[PDB]
Amino acid sequence: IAAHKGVNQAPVPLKMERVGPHDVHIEMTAQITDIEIDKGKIYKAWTFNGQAPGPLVVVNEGDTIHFTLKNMDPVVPHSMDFHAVHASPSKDFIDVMPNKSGTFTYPANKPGVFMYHCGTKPVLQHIANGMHGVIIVKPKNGYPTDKEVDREYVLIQNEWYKYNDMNDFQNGVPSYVVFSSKALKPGDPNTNGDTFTLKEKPLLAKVGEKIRLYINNVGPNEVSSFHVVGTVFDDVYLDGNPNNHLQGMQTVMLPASGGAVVEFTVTRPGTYPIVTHQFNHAQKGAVAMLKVTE
Amino acid sequence: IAAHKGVNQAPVPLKMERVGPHDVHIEMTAQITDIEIDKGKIYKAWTFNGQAPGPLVVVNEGDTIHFTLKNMDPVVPHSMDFHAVHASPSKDFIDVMPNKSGTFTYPANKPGVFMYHCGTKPVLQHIANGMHGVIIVKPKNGYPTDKEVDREYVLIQNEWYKYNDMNDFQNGVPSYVVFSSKALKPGDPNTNGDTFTLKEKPLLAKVGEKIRLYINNVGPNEVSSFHVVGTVFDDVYLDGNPNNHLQGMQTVMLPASGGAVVEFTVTRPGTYPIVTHQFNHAQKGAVAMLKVTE
Amino acid sequence: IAAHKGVNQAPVPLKMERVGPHDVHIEMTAQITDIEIDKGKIYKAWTFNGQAPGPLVVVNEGDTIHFTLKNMDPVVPHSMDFHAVHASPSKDFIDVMPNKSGTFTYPANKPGVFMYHCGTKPVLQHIANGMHGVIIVKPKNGYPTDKEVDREYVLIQNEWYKYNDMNDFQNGVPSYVVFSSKALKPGDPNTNGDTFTLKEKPLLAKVGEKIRLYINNVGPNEVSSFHVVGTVFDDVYLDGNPNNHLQGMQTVMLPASGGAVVEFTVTRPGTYPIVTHQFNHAQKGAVAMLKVTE
Numbered sequence: 001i002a003a004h005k006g007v008n009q010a011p012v013p014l015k016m017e018r019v020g021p022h023d024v025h026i027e028m029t030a031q032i033t034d035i036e037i038d039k040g041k042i043y044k045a046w047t048f049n050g051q052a053p054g055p056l057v058v059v060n061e062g063d064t065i066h067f068t069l070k071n072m073d074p075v076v077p078h079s080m081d082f083h084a085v086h087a088s089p090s091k092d093f094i095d096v097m098p099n100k101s102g103t104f105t106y107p108a109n110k111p112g113v114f115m116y117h118c119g120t121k122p123v124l125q126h127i128a129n130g131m132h133g134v135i136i137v138k139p140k141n142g143y144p145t146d147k148e149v150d151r152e153y154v155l156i157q158n159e160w161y162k163y164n165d166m167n168d169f170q171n172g173v174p175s176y177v178v179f180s181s182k183a184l185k186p187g188d189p190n191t192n193g194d195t196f197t198l199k200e201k202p203l204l205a206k207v208g209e210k211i212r213l214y215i216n217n218v219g220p221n222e223v224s225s226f227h228v229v230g231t232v233f234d235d236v237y238l239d240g241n242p243n244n245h246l247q248g249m250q251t252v253m254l255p256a257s258g259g260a261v262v263e264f265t266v267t268r269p270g271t272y273p274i275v276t277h278q279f280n281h282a283q284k285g286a287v288a289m290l291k292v293t294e
Numbered sequence: 295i296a297a298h299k300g301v302n303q304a305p306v307p308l309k310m311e312r313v314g315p316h317d318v319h320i321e322m323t324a325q326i327t328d329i330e331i332d333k334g335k336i337y338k339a340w341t342f343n344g345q346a347p348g349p350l351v352v353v354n355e356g357d358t359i360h361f362t363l364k365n366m367d368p369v370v371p372h373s374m375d376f377h378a379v380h381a382s383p384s385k386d387f388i389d390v391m392p393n394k395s396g397t398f399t400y401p402a403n404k405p406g407v408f409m410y411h412c413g414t415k416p417v418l419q420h421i422a423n424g425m426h427g428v429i430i431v432k433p434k435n436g437y438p439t440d441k442e443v444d445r446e447y448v449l450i451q452n453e454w455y456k457y458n459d460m461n462d463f464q465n466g467v468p469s470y471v472v473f474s475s476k477a478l479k480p481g482d483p484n485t486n487g488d489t490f491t492l493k494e495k496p497l498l499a500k501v502g503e504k505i506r507l508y509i510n511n512v513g514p515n516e517v518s519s520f521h522v523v524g525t526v527f528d529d530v531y532l533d534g535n536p537n538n539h540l541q542g543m544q545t546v547m548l549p550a551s552g553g554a555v556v557e558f559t560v561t562r563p564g565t566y567p568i569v570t571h572q573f574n575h576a577q578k579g580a581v582a583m584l585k586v587t588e
Numbered sequence: 589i590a591a592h593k594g595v596n597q598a599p600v601p602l603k604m605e606r607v608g609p610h611d612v613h614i615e616m617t618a619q620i621t622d623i624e625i626d627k628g629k630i631y632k633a634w635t636f637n638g639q640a641p642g643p644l645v646v647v648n649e650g651d652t653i654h655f656t657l658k659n660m661d662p663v664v665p666h667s668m669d670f671h672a673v674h675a676s677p678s679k680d681f682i683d684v685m686p687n688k689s690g691t692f693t694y695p696a697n698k699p700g701v702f703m704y705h706c707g708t709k710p711v712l713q714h715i716a717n718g719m720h721g722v723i724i725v726k727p728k729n730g731y732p733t734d735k736e737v738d739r740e741y742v743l744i745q746n747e748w749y750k751y752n753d754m755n756d757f758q759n760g761v762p763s764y765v766v767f768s769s770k771a772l773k774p775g776d777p778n779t780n781g782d783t784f785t786l787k788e789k790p791l792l793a794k795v796g797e798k799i800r801l802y803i804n805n806v807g808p809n810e811v812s813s814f815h816v817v818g819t820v821f822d823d824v825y826l827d828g829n830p831n832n833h834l835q836g837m838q839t840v841m842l843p844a845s846g847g848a849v850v851e852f853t854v855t856r857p858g859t860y861p862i863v864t865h866q867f868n869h870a871q872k873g874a875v876a877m878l879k880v881t882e
């Protein structure tokens with residue numbers, strides 16, 4: 001794309017504010033931003049807000065979202081599909097033209113860990129170039145195990161392919177498969193999907209803690225076999241719905257776009273790798289680290 | 295196959311009749327039939343009854359099936375394996391020679407949404423060429439959410455490869471991944487697995503309705519990440535067994551041959567895409583449409 | 589690897605003994621051993637104890653494992669990661685150098701069917717070359733269906749690639765996908781992952797029996813769609829945890845490293861194939877047989 005040559009739009013902060021007991025405003029951008037996905041490898045990503053995956057959104061069950069997308073891409077239209085919401089896709093997930101904005105309103109009635117992504121045709125191209133992310137909807141009555149949790153983080157898995165190559169997107173193996181972490185509280189790391197950041201700067205915890213991870217595999221194409229080395233998941237809630245409760249799982253399978261809330265205890269000091277156990281993907285980048293100290 | 299050159303056997307209707315309170319007769323054919331799997335692309339499919347996937351079969355829990363296969367293929371033997379039944383594979387799923395018939399009897403004791411397919415060696419070749427389908431076994435006591443359902447449809451996902459190419463079947467990516475719909479009531483569409491029919495002629499519903507889909511991924515090779523754009527699944531029954539109940543899932547993972555009953559509400563008028571969220575497969579055809587009107 | 593040329597170390601028996609009501613000693617080797625993975629095809633595997641997958645380990649819920657690895661490989665370091673245990677990976681899953689031994693201690697608190705494997709970097713290389721296996725942890729209170737089970741076996745699925753070829757391990761399709769069986773009681777077969785042994789020498793059962801299979805898909809890379817032809821799973825316990833109970837499943841999806849306990853009835857005499865229903869993998873070897881006699 002000639003109009004993207006030389007373009008590197010600086011990241012713009014997510015804007016969110018509550019406007020009523022059950023209403024929240026969210027404003028995002030669509031923008032073109034260089035991201036280092038592996039050491040020495042820059043991908044000129046199509047992004048929300050200059051992050052890939054995009055910024056974390058958190059709302060409460062029952063919130064209506066008033067969402068605005070400002071399209072900063074000079075030539076390509078973009079859109080937004082939140083898996084959390086009930087909406088008419090042909091009226092509410094529609095394209096915003098370059099240099100324009102669009103506003104859409106829809107309710108988030110269901111708790112869980114949902115994917116969001118651009119919905120512009122061809123959707124594979126927009127997702128693969130980086131237009132994906134997670135929205136968490138907090139359950140009204142929490143999770144049954146809330147009282148046991150000592151620390152929590154968000155992890156997202158995605159793939160990267162050859163740059164803007166539709167043949168590779170459709171028919172090729174991923175070049176990289178990566179984790180990123182998105183901040184829930186001040187001080188938490190907030191990273192892009194790359195092969196190295198969560199190895200060099202591990203997530204942190206204390207010996208004996210029960211950790212909760214909110215996880216989602218945004219794809220675009222692969223399923224995930226999510227596993228924390230050195231522990232077993234005490235509790236798993238599929239898609240983050242409190243009713244979908246499994247216990248004692250070694251590994252949690254996630255479809256493309258699938259999410260979960262997983263909880264586990266770290267019993268001894270050391271560094272605990274976090275992987276997809278499809279080890280071709282782990283070898284291509286999908287290993288994060290959790291450093292546990294006394 | 296020289297004996298298949300020029301062969302295009304017209305579709306034959308499925309024959310079924312109840313012969314007792316718990317006994318049903320089913321008669322199918324194995325036949326060679328040209329199917330348009332993508333615009334301008336004809337596949338000379340190996341089929342049951344001239345449809346790929348084959349015709350829908352529906353029985354009640356506890357029915358014994360008296361099944362006859364008439365093999366119209368001039369050279370290749372064919373057989374039938376129903377996942378619904380308890381049977382001896384080496385006596386009951388055996389080959390029927392060209393121009394012959396065979397009759398087999400076995401019970402369907404378990405409710406759900408089951409794959410059926412030809413069981414002739416090499417099974418990969420017979421499935422990939424089109425010999426797959428779905429049998430639904432209705433639960434004796436229904437599903438707990440029956441009273442909420444306003445409309446229902448059946449969807450099946452399958453792949454297509456290079457024509458009768460065993461190397462591609464074993465080692466290659468699918469050329470197309472497709473949905474088809476099979477009729478439950480008069481007026482419902484009944485389609486083959488192709489990239490376009492359910493886009494051009496969407497399934498129909500009314501605003502506010504709760505929709506039930508009976509779904510199965512027949513493969514042969516891929517898993518599915520089933521998702522309806524613009525909604526969340528209120529209830530999911532894995533393999534269609536009423537006990538395997540999940541709630542509030544954004545996306546339902548299906549193994550190869552796996553089925554489910556999923557239910558969701560459409561809240562606003564518009565067109566709702568239905569996808570596998572493995573977007574390489576969606577790009578290669580696996581998008582259907584649901585048109586919701588006021 | 590020049591130091592592996594001509595090396596074929598004879599299999600060494602697993603050593604295990606109980607040393608207290610809740611403590612068990614286990615001693616394994618890491619060794620280089622030629623295995624016939626397909627007719628006429630020898631793979632010089634990296635193994636535990638000269639088997640690939642490695643020997644079966646069975647312990648009770650709540651046992652602490654005192655594990656010793658003796659590394660017989662002349663040049664490559666090796667290690668052990670048990671998915672069953674809570675451990676510090678950076679202190680307890682560490683490398684043992686050639687011709688040395690290491691001892692590690694950790695508890696197995698959770699019931700189920702867990703993968704074990706070498707944890708030496710790059711882990712993909714060590715798993716793909718054969719360093720994988722299963723440990724079963726028996727639940728304190730059993731499974732709710734124990735009284736119904738007449739016979740039980742263990743099955744493991746794995747892949748084989750081009751010999752020690754990291755590009756193929758990361759980017760290629762498997763050359764073979766295979767089942768193996770590991771003995772639970774005297775007289776049970778104990779086999780390696782190959783394309784033929786469980787076809788030529790099927791597992792055995794009697795008409796009318798309820799069979800339990802302990803299953804795990806060790807990968808390294810693929811997910812599994814586990815199915816027994818001619819039956820339906822009466823009960824399924826995901827990861828072998830008694831709480832994760834599904835009923836009436838035709839096919840059980842397993843992530844890479846995922847396990848299950850599955851139970852089904854064989855109603856008629858004959859031979860029942862056992863497959864992954866991803867039929868490209870079945871065609872490449874992943875079909876076992878169960879012979880049922882009167």
Ligand SMILES: [Cu+2]
Nearest residue numbers: 019024025066
């Ligand atoms: Cu507003």
Ligand SMILES: [Cu+2]
Nearest residue numbers: 078118120126
């Ligand atoms: Cu876009």
Ligand SMILES: [Cu+2]
Nearest residue numbers: 081083117257
């Ligand atoms: Cu989506």
Ligand SMILES: [Cu+2]
Nearest residue numbers: 150208209210
């Ligand atoms: Cu704690």
Ligand SMILES: [Cu+2]
Nearest residue numbers: 313318319360
């Ligand atoms: Cu009859």
Ligand SMILES: [Cu+2]
Nearest residue numbers: 372412414420
């Ligand atoms: Cu056939």
Ligand SMILES: [Cu+2]
Nearest residue numbers: 375377411551
């Ligand atoms: Cu089958």
Ligand SMILES: [Cu+2]
Nearest residue numbers: 444502503504
């Ligand atoms: Cu209604």
Ligand SMILES: [Cu+2]
Nearest residue numbers: 607612613654
């Ligand atoms: Cu000891």
Ligand SMILES: [Cu+2]
Nearest residue numbers: 666706708714
């Ligand atoms: Cu090793």
Ligand SMILES: [Cu+2]
Nearest residue numbers: 669671705845
């Ligand atoms: Cu592991």
Ligand SMILES: [Cu+2]
Nearest residue numbers: 738796797798
């Ligand atoms: Cu019995």
Ligand SMILES: [Cu+2]
Nearest residue numbers: 253547548841
């Ligand atoms: Cu799955």
